[PDB]
Amino acid sequence: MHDFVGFMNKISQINRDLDKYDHTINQVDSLHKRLLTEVNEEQASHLRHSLDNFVAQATDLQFKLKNEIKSAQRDGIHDTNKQAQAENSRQRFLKLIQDYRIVDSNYKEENKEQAKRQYMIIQPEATEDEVEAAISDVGGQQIFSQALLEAKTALAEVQARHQELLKLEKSMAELTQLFNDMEELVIEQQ
Ligand SMILES: [Zn+2]
Ligand SMILES: [Zn+2]
């Protein structure tokens, strides 16, 4: 059994990490949902604390799983059995990566909607285009500047939301890079 136990142990570890990854993604989605409802600033601050932690956790798992799975894929180059197990884990990883990308895309959309509503509350007569312009980088700056002629709270809220958005954009860019990385083949070398 010594020639096969090592490989199965690798597969088992990979699948354990996938379970952890899956759980991590769920926590992220769960925290996103609670954050969209939290009214207490004191409690909201800890939710973001947990969120940041889980996102870092997911980032760590992703890196490890990428290297472990591709490594497993190499072990099965000319071993039908090993190839199938590694591919199996690779397919599970791909699905979770996609689930995570969706979780973040969904939160991104909730974020933007809040941005638009904040402005409509200020400009209850604003048209779509005006609302769309108001949340753009240039549009927001123009509004802030134009104001420099209650904007503190508004600007602080905007900045906080903008920062959250950039974080999501960053993770999503990482997930896309990772997804593409996993889609790439693990090829023979001689
Ligand atoms: Zn043996
Ligand atoms: Zn905390």
mmCIF file of N, CA and C in Angstrom, residues 29-158:
data_model
loop_
_atom_site.group_PDB
_atom_site.id
_atom_site.type_symbol
_atom_site.label_atom_id
_atom_site.label_comp_id
_atom_site.label_asym_id
_atom_site.label_seq_id
_atom_site.Cartn_x
_atom_site.Cartn_y
_atom_site.Cartn_z
ATOM 1 N N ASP A 29 -20.748 34.821 2.686
ATOM 2 C CA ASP A 29 -22.084 35.144 2.206
ATOM 3 C C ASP A 29 -22.990 35.512 3.384
ATOM 4 N N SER A 30 -22.888 34.746 4.465
ATOM 5 C CA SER A 30 -23.694 34.981 5.657
ATOM 6 C C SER A 30 -23.409 36.348 6.281
ATOM 7 N N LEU A 31 -22.128 36.699 6.403
ATOM 8 C CA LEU A 31 -21.744 37.985 6.975
ATOM 9 C C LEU A 31 -22.201 39.133 6.075
ATOM 10 N N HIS A 32 -22.137 38.924 4.760
ATOM 11 C CA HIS A 32 -22.576 39.943 3.805
ATOM 12 C C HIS A 32 -24.040 40.272 4.103
ATOM 13 N N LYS A 33 -24.846 39.224 4.225
ATOM 14 C CA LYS A 33 -26.267 39.378 4.493
ATOM 15 C C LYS A 33 -26.566 40.088 5.807
ATOM 16 N N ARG A 34 -25.849 39.732 6.869
ATOM 17 C CA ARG A 34 -26.064 40.384 8.154
ATOM 18 C C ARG A 34 -25.636 41.845 8.089
ATOM 19 N N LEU A 35 -24.545 42.113 7.385
ATOM 20 C CA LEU A 35 -24.062 43.482 7.254
ATOM 21 C C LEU A 35 -25.074 44.368 6.526
ATOM 22 N N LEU A 36 -25.834 43.780 5.609
ATOM 23 C CA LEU A 36 -26.829 44.539 4.863
ATOM 24 C C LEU A 36 -28.014 44.906 5.747
ATOM 25 N N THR A 37 -28.083 44.296 6.925
ATOM 26 C CA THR A 37 -29.185 44.543 7.845
ATOM 27 C C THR A 37 -28.781 45.261 9.134
ATOM 28 N N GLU A 38 -27.551 45.046 9.583
ATOM 29 C CA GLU A 38 -27.085 45.651 10.821
ATOM 30 C C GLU A 38 -27.259 47.160 10.903
ATOM 31 N N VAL A 39 -27.880 47.612 11.988
ATOM 32 C CA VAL A 39 -28.102 49.036 12.213
ATOM 33 C C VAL A 39 -27.175 49.541 13.312
ATOM 34 N N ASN A 40 -26.774 48.638 14.201
ATOM 35 C CA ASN A 40 -25.890 48.995 15.301
ATOM 36 C C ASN A 40 -24.443 49.078 14.828
ATOM 37 N N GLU A 41 -23.881 50.283 14.870
ATOM 38 C CA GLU A 41 -22.509 50.512 14.438
ATOM 39 C C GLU A 41 -21.517 49.672 15.228
ATOM 40 N N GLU A 42 -21.763 49.552 16.526
ATOM 41 C CA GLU A 42 -20.894 48.786 17.404
ATOM 42 C C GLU A 42 -20.814 47.339 16.917
ATOM 43 N N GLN A 43 -21.967 46.749 16.623
ATOM 44 C CA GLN A 43 -22.000 45.372 16.156
ATOM 45 C C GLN A 43 -21.519 45.230 14.709
ATOM 46 N N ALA A 44 -21.825 46.223 13.882
ATOM 47 C CA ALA A 44 -21.422 46.199 12.482
ATOM 48 C C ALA A 44 -19.907 46.139 12.340
ATOM 49 N N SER A 45 -19.203 46.826 13.235
ATOM 50 C CA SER A 45 -17.743 46.862 13.192
ATOM 51 C C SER A 45 -17.113 45.485 13.394
ATOM 52 N N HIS A 46 -17.761 44.640 14.187
ATOM 53 C CA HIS A 46 -17.243 43.304 14.437
ATOM 54 C C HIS A 46 -17.590 42.391 13.279
ATOM 55 N N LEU A 47 -18.720 42.657 12.634
ATOM 56 C CA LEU A 47 -19.111 41.847 11.493
ATOM 57 C C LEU A 47 -18.052 42.034 10.406
ATOM 58 N N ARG A 48 -17.612 43.273 10.209
ATOM 59 C CA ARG A 48 -16.591 43.549 9.205
ATOM 60 C C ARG A 48 -15.289 42.885 9.622
ATOM 61 N N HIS A 49 -15.072 42.781 10.931
ATOM 62 C CA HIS A 49 -13.865 42.144 11.447
ATOM 63 C C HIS A 49 -13.873 40.676 11.037
ATOM 64 N N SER A 50 -15.008 40.014 11.241
ATOM 65 C CA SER A 50 -15.128 38.610 10.883
ATOM 66 C C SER A 50 -15.042 38.447 9.378
ATOM 67 N N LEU A 51 -15.727 39.325 8.659
ATOM 68 C CA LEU A 51 -15.714 39.247 7.213
ATOM 69 C C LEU A 51 -14.282 39.308 6.695
ATOM 70 N N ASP A 52 -13.538 40.340 7.091
ATOM 71 C CA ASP A 52 -12.157 40.486 6.634
ATOM 72 C C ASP A 52 -11.358 39.224 6.920
ATOM 73 N N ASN A 53 -11.555 38.666 8.111
ATOM 74 C CA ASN A 53 -10.851 37.448 8.494
ATOM 75 C C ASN A 53 -11.190 36.277 7.567
ATOM 76 N N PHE A 54 -12.474 36.042 7.323
ATOM 77 C CA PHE A 54 -12.851 34.943 6.448
ATOM 78 C C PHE A 54 -12.343 35.146 5.027
ATOM 79 N N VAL A 55 -12.327 36.391 4.558
ATOM 80 C CA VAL A 55 -11.846 36.654 3.207
ATOM 81 C C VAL A 55 -10.364 36.311 3.124
ATOM 82 N N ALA A 56 -9.620 36.647 4.175
ATOM 83 C CA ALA A 56 -8.197 36.343 4.203
ATOM 84 C C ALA A 56 -8.055 34.818 4.243
ATOM 85 N N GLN A 57 -8.929 34.177 5.008
ATOM 86 C CA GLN A 57 -8.932 32.719 5.151
ATOM 87 C C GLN A 57 -9.158 32.061 3.793
ATOM 88 N N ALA A 58 -10.114 32.593 3.041
ATOM 89 C CA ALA A 58 -10.422 32.047 1.720
ATOM 90 C C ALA A 58 -9.217 32.232 0.798
ATOM 91 N N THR A 59 -8.579 33.395 0.894
ATOM 92 C CA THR A 59 -7.415 33.689 0.074
ATOM 93 C C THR A 59 -6.322 32.664 0.356
ATOM 94 N N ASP A 60 -6.152 32.309 1.623
ATOM 95 C CA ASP A 60 -5.130 31.342 1.979
ATOM 96 C C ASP A 60 -5.458 29.959 1.441
ATOM 97 N N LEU A 61 -6.700 29.525 1.640
ATOM 98 C CA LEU A 61 -7.117 28.213 1.168
ATOM 99 C C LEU A 61 -6.934 28.113 -0.345
ATOM 100 N N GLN A 62 -7.422 29.119 -1.069
ATOM 101 C CA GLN A 62 -7.316 29.154 -2.528
ATOM 102 C C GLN A 62 -5.903 28.904 -3.021
ATOM 103 N N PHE A 63 -4.943 29.592 -2.420
ATOM 104 C CA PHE A 63 -3.545 29.445 -2.813
ATOM 105 C C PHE A 63 -3.068 28.013 -2.583
ATOM 106 N N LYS A 64 -3.373 27.486 -1.401
ATOM 107 C CA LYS A 64 -2.964 26.138 -1.032
ATOM 108 C C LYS A 64 -3.628 25.078 -1.908
ATOM 109 N N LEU A 65 -4.939 25.190 -2.085
ATOM 110 C CA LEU A 65 -5.676 24.247 -2.910
ATOM 111 C C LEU A 65 -5.150 24.257 -4.346
ATOM 112 N N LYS A 66 -4.821 25.443 -4.863
ATOM 113 C CA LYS A 66 -4.305 25.544 -6.228
ATOM 114 C C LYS A 66 -3.052 24.691 -6.373
ATOM 115 N N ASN A 67 -2.102 24.889 -5.467
ATOM 116 C CA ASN A 67 -0.850 24.150 -5.509
ATOM 117 C C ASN A 67 -1.003 22.655 -5.228
ATOM 118 N N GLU A 68 -1.888 22.301 -4.299
ATOM 119 C CA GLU A 68 -2.098 20.894 -3.955
ATOM 120 C C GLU A 68 -2.773 20.132 -5.086
ATOM 121 N N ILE A 69 -3.806 20.725 -5.677
ATOM 122 C CA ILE A 69 -4.527 20.071 -6.758
ATOM 123 C C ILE A 69 -3.684 19.911 -8.019
ATOM 124 N N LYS A 70 -2.986 20.966 -8.425
ATOM 125 C CA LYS A 70 -2.134 20.863 -9.611
ATOM 126 C C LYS A 70 -1.041 19.829 -9.332
ATOM 127 N N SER A 71 -0.602 19.762 -8.082
ATOM 128 C CA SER A 71 0.416 18.798 -7.700
ATOM 129 C C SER A 71 -0.187 17.399 -7.832
ATOM 130 N N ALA A 72 -1.428 17.247 -7.384
ATOM 131 C CA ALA A 72 -2.106 15.962 -7.470
ATOM 132 C C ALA A 72 -2.298 15.595 -8.935
ATOM 133 N N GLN A 73 -2.597 16.599 -9.754
ATOM 134 C CA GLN A 73 -2.804 16.388 -11.180
ATOM 135 C C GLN A 73 -1.541 15.837 -11.820
ATOM 136 N N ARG A 74 -0.385 16.327 -11.391
ATOM 137 C CA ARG A 74 0.856 15.824 -11.951
ATOM 138 C C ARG A 74 1.033 14.352 -11.604
ATOM 139 N N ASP A 75 0.740 13.986 -10.359
ATOM 140 C CA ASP A 75 0.893 12.599 -9.936
ATOM 141 C C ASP A 75 0.117 11.615 -10.793
ATOM 142 N N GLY A 76 -0.945 12.078 -11.437
ATOM 143 C CA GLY A 76 -1.741 11.174 -12.248
ATOM 144 C C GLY A 76 -1.590 11.299 -13.749
ATOM 145 N N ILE A 77 -0.495 11.895 -14.208
ATOM 146 C CA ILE A 77 -0.258 12.065 -15.640
ATOM 147 C C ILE A 77 -0.512 10.790 -16.448
ATOM 148 N N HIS A 78 0.107 9.689 -16.031
ATOM 149 C CA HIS A 78 -0.044 8.414 -16.724
ATOM 150 C C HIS A 78 -0.670 7.359 -15.828
ATOM 151 N N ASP A 79 -1.462 7.810 -14.867
ATOM 152 C CA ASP A 79 -2.137 6.914 -13.942
ATOM 153 C C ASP A 79 -3.603 7.305 -13.975
ATOM 154 N N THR A 80 -4.381 6.572 -14.760
ATOM 155 C CA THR A 80 -5.802 6.830 -14.916
ATOM 156 C C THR A 80 -6.493 7.103 -13.588
ATOM 157 N N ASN A 81 -6.266 6.229 -12.615
ATOM 158 C CA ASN A 81 -6.873 6.368 -11.296
ATOM 159 C C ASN A 81 -6.542 7.700 -10.635
ATOM 160 N N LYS A 82 -5.254 7.995 -10.527
ATOM 161 C CA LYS A 82 -4.830 9.232 -9.898
ATOM 162 C C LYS A 82 -5.367 10.438 -10.652
ATOM 163 N N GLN A 83 -5.340 10.373 -11.979
ATOM 164 C CA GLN A 83 -5.842 11.475 -12.802
ATOM 165 C C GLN A 83 -7.304 11.774 -12.476
ATOM 166 N N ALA A 84 -8.117 10.727 -12.392
ATOM 167 C CA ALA A 84 -9.534 10.899 -12.091
ATOM 168 C C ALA A 84 -9.789 11.523 -10.709
ATOM 169 N N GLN A 85 -9.039 11.106 -9.694
ATOM 170 C CA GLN A 85 -9.246 11.661 -8.358
ATOM 171 C C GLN A 85 -8.885 13.133 -8.289
ATOM 172 N N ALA A 86 -7.751 13.481 -8.876
ATOM 173 C CA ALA A 86 -7.297 14.859 -8.882
ATOM 174 C C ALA A 86 -8.272 15.722 -9.690
ATOM 175 N N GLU A 87 -8.700 15.221 -10.847
ATOM 176 C CA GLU A 87 -9.634 15.968 -11.683
ATOM 177 C C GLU A 87 -10.909 16.195 -10.896
ATOM 178 N N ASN A 88 -11.328 15.169 -10.162
ATOM 179 C CA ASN A 88 -12.530 15.249 -9.341
ATOM 180 C C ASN A 88 -12.413 16.399 -8.346
ATOM 181 N N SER A 89 -11.264 16.497 -7.687
ATOM 182 C CA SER A 89 -11.057 17.574 -6.724
ATOM 183 C C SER A 89 -10.982 18.914 -7.448
ATOM 184 N N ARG A 90 -10.381 18.921 -8.635
ATOM 185 C CA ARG A 90 -10.254 20.153 -9.400
ATOM 186 C C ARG A 90 -11.643 20.670 -9.774
ATOM 187 N N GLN A 91 -12.541 19.764 -10.152
ATOM 188 C CA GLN A 91 -13.896 20.165 -10.524
ATOM 189 C C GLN A 91 -14.662 20.730 -9.332
ATOM 190 N N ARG A 92 -14.424 20.170 -8.155
ATOM 191 C CA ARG A 92 -15.098 20.658 -6.967
ATOM 192 C C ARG A 92 -14.561 22.057 -6.637
ATOM 193 N N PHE A 93 -13.259 22.245 -6.797
ATOM 194 C CA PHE A 93 -12.639 23.535 -6.516
ATOM 195 C C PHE A 93 -13.217 24.608 -7.446
ATOM 196 N N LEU A 94 -13.326 24.280 -8.732
ATOM 197 C CA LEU A 94 -13.867 25.201 -9.733
ATOM 198 C C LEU A 94 -15.281 25.653 -9.380
ATOM 199 N N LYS A 95 -16.112 24.724 -8.924
ATOM 200 C CA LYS A 95 -17.473 25.082 -8.555
ATOM 201 C C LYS A 95 -17.497 26.030 -7.357
ATOM 202 N N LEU A 96 -16.683 25.752 -6.344
ATOM 203 C CA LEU A 96 -16.662 26.618 -5.172
ATOM 204 C C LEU A 96 -16.123 27.998 -5.524
ATOM 205 N N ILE A 97 -15.143 28.052 -6.422
ATOM 206 C CA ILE A 97 -14.575 29.328 -6.844
ATOM 207 C C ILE A 97 -15.679 30.145 -7.508
ATOM 208 N N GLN A 98 -16.494 29.472 -8.311
ATOM 209 C CA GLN A 98 -17.581 30.144 -9.006
ATOM 210 C C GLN A 98 -18.611 30.612 -7.992
ATOM 211 N N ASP A 99 -18.909 29.772 -7.002
ATOM 212 C CA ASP A 99 -19.877 30.148 -5.976
ATOM 213 C C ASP A 99 -19.408 31.410 -5.255
ATOM 214 N N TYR A 100 -18.113 31.467 -4.968
ATOM 215 C CA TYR A 100 -17.533 32.611 -4.277
ATOM 216 C C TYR A 100 -17.648 33.870 -5.155
ATOM 217 N N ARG A 101 -17.330 33.745 -6.443
ATOM 218 C CA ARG A 101 -17.414 34.880 -7.364
ATOM 219 C C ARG A 101 -18.840 35.424 -7.407
ATOM 220 N N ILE A 102 -19.809 34.523 -7.352
ATOM 221 C CA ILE A 102 -21.210 34.921 -7.361
ATOM 222 C C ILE A 102 -21.564 35.608 -6.049
ATOM 223 N N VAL A 103 -21.097 35.044 -4.939
ATOM 224 C CA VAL A 103 -21.362 35.646 -3.641
ATOM 225 C C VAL A 103 -20.874 37.098 -3.648
ATOM 226 N N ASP A 104 -19.661 37.324 -4.138
ATOM 227 C CA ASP A 104 -19.112 38.676 -4.173
ATOM 228 C C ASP A 104 -19.795 39.575 -5.205
ATOM 229 N N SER A 105 -20.181 39.010 -6.342
ATOM 230 C CA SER A 105 -20.866 39.813 -7.352
ATOM 231 C C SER A 105 -22.198 40.302 -6.774
ATOM 232 N N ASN A 106 -22.901 39.407 -6.086
ATOM 233 C CA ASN A 106 -24.182 39.747 -5.470
ATOM 234 C C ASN A 106 -24.042 40.888 -4.466
ATOM 235 N N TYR A 107 -23.004 40.817 -3.631
ATOM 236 C CA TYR A 107 -22.748 41.850 -2.625
ATOM 237 C C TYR A 107 -22.361 43.157 -3.328
ATOM 238 N N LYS A 108 -21.609 43.055 -4.418
ATOM 239 C CA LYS A 108 -21.223 44.243 -5.165
ATOM 240 C C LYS A 108 -22.493 44.980 -5.608
ATOM 241 N N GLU A 109 -23.468 44.233 -6.111
ATOM 242 C CA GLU A 109 -24.704 44.836 -6.586
ATOM 243 C C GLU A 109 -25.511 45.481 -5.467
ATOM 244 N N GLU A 110 -25.520 44.858 -4.298
ATOM 245 C CA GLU A 110 -26.258 45.423 -3.185
ATOM 246 C C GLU A 110 -25.582 46.745 -2.819
ATOM 247 N N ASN A 111 -24.250 46.748 -2.885
ATOM 248 C CA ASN A 111 -23.442 47.921 -2.563
ATOM 249 C C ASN A 111 -23.800 49.087 -3.482
ATOM 250 N N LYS A 112 -23.777 48.840 -4.784
ATOM 251 C CA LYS A 112 -24.110 49.873 -5.751
ATOM 252 C C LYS A 112 -25.526 50.395 -5.543
ATOM 253 N N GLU A 113 -26.475 49.498 -5.290
ATOM 254 C CA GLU A 113 -27.851 49.942 -5.089
ATOM 255 C C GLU A 113 -27.925 50.898 -3.907
ATOM 256 N N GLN A 114 -27.192 50.606 -2.837
ATOM 257 C CA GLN A 114 -27.196 51.489 -1.675
ATOM 258 C C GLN A 114 -26.630 52.849 -2.069
ATOM 259 N N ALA A 115 -25.622 52.839 -2.930
ATOM 260 C CA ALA A 115 -25.010 54.078 -3.402
ATOM 261 C C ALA A 115 -26.071 54.898 -4.137
ATOM 262 N N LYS A 116 -26.790 54.265 -5.055
ATOM 263 C CA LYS A 116 -27.822 54.982 -5.799
ATOM 264 C C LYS A 116 -28.926 55.526 -4.887
ATOM 265 N N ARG A 117 -29.371 54.724 -3.927
ATOM 266 C CA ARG A 117 -30.446 55.164 -3.036
ATOM 267 C C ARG A 117 -30.022 56.353 -2.190
ATOM 268 N N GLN A 118 -28.780 56.330 -1.716
ATOM 269 C CA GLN A 118 -28.274 57.418 -0.894
ATOM 270 C C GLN A 118 -28.424 58.714 -1.671
ATOM 271 N N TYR A 119 -28.056 58.684 -2.948
ATOM 272 C CA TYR A 119 -28.157 59.877 -3.764
ATOM 273 C C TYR A 119 -29.596 60.289 -4.073
ATOM 274 N N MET A 120 -30.451 59.329 -4.417
ATOM 275 C CA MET A 120 -31.845 59.651 -4.724
ATOM 276 C C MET A 120 -32.504 60.313 -3.524
ATOM 277 N N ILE A 121 -32.067 59.933 -2.329
ATOM 278 C CA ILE A 121 -32.589 60.513 -1.101
ATOM 279 C C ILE A 121 -32.227 62.000 -1.078
ATOM 280 N N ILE A 122 -31.087 62.330 -1.677
ATOM 281 C CA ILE A 122 -30.623 63.711 -1.754
ATOM 282 C C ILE A 122 -31.279 64.406 -2.936
ATOM 283 N N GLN A 123 -31.381 63.689 -4.053
ATOM 284 C CA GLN A 123 -31.982 64.215 -5.276
ATOM 285 C C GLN A 123 -33.185 63.361 -5.682
ATOM 286 N N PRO A 124 -34.277 63.425 -4.902
ATOM 287 C CA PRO A 124 -35.495 62.657 -5.171
ATOM 288 C C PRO A 124 -36.086 62.851 -6.557
ATOM 289 N N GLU A 125 -35.549 63.801 -7.313
ATOM 290 C CA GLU A 125 -36.032 64.075 -8.664
ATOM 291 C C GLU A 125 -35.024 63.652 -9.732
ATOM 292 N N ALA A 126 -33.901 63.093 -9.291
ATOM 293 C CA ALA A 126 -32.847 62.660 -10.198
ATOM 294 C C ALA A 126 -33.298 61.586 -11.177
ATOM 295 N N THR A 127 -32.796 61.673 -12.404
ATOM 296 C CA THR A 127 -33.115 60.698 -13.441
ATOM 297 C C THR A 127 -32.097 59.571 -13.338
ATOM 298 N N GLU A 128 -32.349 58.463 -14.028
ATOM 299 C CA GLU A 128 -31.427 57.335 -13.996
ATOM 300 C C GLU A 128 -30.019 57.813 -14.290
ATOM 301 N N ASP A 129 -29.851 58.417 -15.462
ATOM 302 C CA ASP A 129 -28.549 58.914 -15.888
ATOM 303 C C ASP A 129 -27.878 59.775 -14.825
ATOM 304 N N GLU A 130 -28.646 60.651 -14.189
ATOM 305 C CA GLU A 130 -28.099 61.513 -13.152
ATOM 306 C C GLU A 130 -27.646 60.667 -11.968
ATOM 307 N N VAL A 131 -28.466 59.689 -11.587
ATOM 308 C CA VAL A 131 -28.124 58.805 -10.479
ATOM 309 C C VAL A 131 -26.863 58.029 -10.853
ATOM 310 N N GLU A 132 -26.848 57.461 -12.054
ATOM 311 C CA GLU A 132 -25.686 56.718 -12.528
ATOM 312 C C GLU A 132 -24.433 57.601 -12.479
ATOM 313 N N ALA A 133 -24.566 58.853 -12.906
ATOM 314 C CA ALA A 133 -23.432 59.774 -12.903
ATOM 315 C C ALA A 133 -22.971 60.077 -11.485
ATOM 316 N N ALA A 134 -23.937 60.290 -10.601
ATOM 317 C CA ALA A 134 -23.644 60.632 -9.216
ATOM 318 C C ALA A 134 -22.778 59.629 -8.466
ATOM 319 N N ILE A 135 -22.881 58.349 -8.809
ATOM 320 C CA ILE A 135 -22.099 57.333 -8.114
ATOM 321 C C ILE A 135 -20.763 57.031 -8.788
ATOM 322 N N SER A 136 -20.532 57.608 -9.964
ATOM 323 C CA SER A 136 -19.268 57.371 -10.662
ATOM 324 C C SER A 136 -18.153 58.101 -9.922
ATOM 325 N N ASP A 137 -16.907 57.761 -10.215
ATOM 326 C CA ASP A 137 -15.812 58.435 -9.538
ATOM 327 C C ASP A 137 -15.891 59.951 -9.782
ATOM 328 N N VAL A 138 -15.964 60.355 -11.045
ATOM 329 C CA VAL A 138 -16.040 61.774 -11.389
ATOM 330 C C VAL A 138 -17.295 62.426 -10.816
ATOM 331 N N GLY A 139 -18.444 61.786 -11.026
ATOM 332 C CA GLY A 139 -19.694 62.331 -10.518
ATOM 333 C C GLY A 139 -19.668 62.627 -9.029
ATOM 334 N N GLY A 140 -19.141 61.688 -8.250
ATOM 335 C CA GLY A 140 -19.070 61.881 -6.811
ATOM 336 C C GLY A 140 -18.181 63.050 -6.422
ATOM 337 N N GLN A 141 -17.017 63.148 -7.064
ATOM 338 C CA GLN A 141 -16.074 64.229 -6.797
ATOM 339 C C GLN A 141 -16.722 65.560 -7.143
ATOM 340 N N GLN A 142 -17.420 65.606 -8.272
ATOM 341 C CA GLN A 142 -18.059 66.844 -8.681
ATOM 342 C C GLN A 142 -19.086 67.273 -7.639
ATOM 343 N N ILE A 143 -19.847 66.313 -7.123
ATOM 344 C CA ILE A 143 -20.854 66.616 -6.113
ATOM 345 C C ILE A 143 -20.179 67.128 -4.850
ATOM 346 N N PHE A 144 -19.158 66.420 -4.388
ATOM 347 C CA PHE A 144 -18.453 66.840 -3.190
ATOM 348 C C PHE A 144 -17.902 68.253 -3.370
ATOM 349 N N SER A 145 -17.220 68.484 -4.487
ATOM 350 C CA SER A 145 -16.647 69.798 -4.763
ATOM 351 C C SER A 145 -17.739 70.850 -4.820
ATOM 352 N N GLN A 146 -18.731 70.615 -5.671
ATOM 353 C CA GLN A 146 -19.847 71.534 -5.834
ATOM 354 C C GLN A 146 -20.422 71.891 -4.466
ATOM 355 N N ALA A 147 -20.345 70.950 -3.532
ATOM 356 C CA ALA A 147 -20.866 71.175 -2.194
ATOM 357 C C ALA A 147 -19.995 72.163 -1.437
ATOM 358 N N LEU A 148 -18.692 72.116 -1.691
ATOM 359 C CA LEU A 148 -17.755 73.013 -1.025
ATOM 360 C C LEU A 148 -17.971 74.465 -1.435
ATOM 361 N N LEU A 149 -19.204 74.798 -1.805
ATOM 362 C CA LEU A 149 -19.540 76.155 -2.213
ATOM 363 C C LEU A 149 -20.739 76.662 -1.412
ATOM 364 N N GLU A 150 -23.501 69.087 6.110
ATOM 365 C CA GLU A 150 -24.067 67.723 6.105
ATOM 366 C C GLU A 150 -23.355 66.847 5.086
ATOM 367 N N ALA A 151 -22.357 67.417 4.420
ATOM 368 C CA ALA A 151 -21.606 66.686 3.407
ATOM 369 C C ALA A 151 -20.548 65.781 4.025
ATOM 370 N N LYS A 152 -20.253 65.989 5.304
ATOM 371 C CA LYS A 152 -19.262 65.167 5.988
ATOM 372 C C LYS A 152 -19.773 63.738 6.124
ATOM 373 N N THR A 153 -20.953 63.596 6.719
ATOM 374 C CA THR A 153 -21.564 62.286 6.912
ATOM 375 C C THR A 153 -21.767 61.612 5.563
ATOM 376 N N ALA A 154 -22.240 62.389 4.595
ATOM 377 C CA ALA A 154 -22.483 61.866 3.259
ATOM 378 C C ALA A 154 -21.179 61.396 2.620
ATOM 379 N N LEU A 155 -20.141 62.216 2.731
ATOM 380 C CA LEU A 155 -18.847 61.883 2.152
ATOM 381 C C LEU A 155 -18.200 60.695 2.872
ATOM 382 N N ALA A 156 -18.331 60.646 4.196
ATOM 383 C CA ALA A 156 -17.766 59.544 4.972
ATOM 384 C C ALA A 156 -18.445 58.242 4.556
ATOM 385 N N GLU A 157 -19.770 58.278 4.476
ATOM 386 C CA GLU A 157 -20.522 57.102 4.070
ATOM 387 C C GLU A 157 -20.060 56.680 2.678
ATOM 388 N N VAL A 158 -19.970 57.634 1.758
ATOM 389 C CA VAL A 158 -19.535 57.319 0.401
ATOM 390 C C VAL A 158 -18.162 56.644 0.381
#
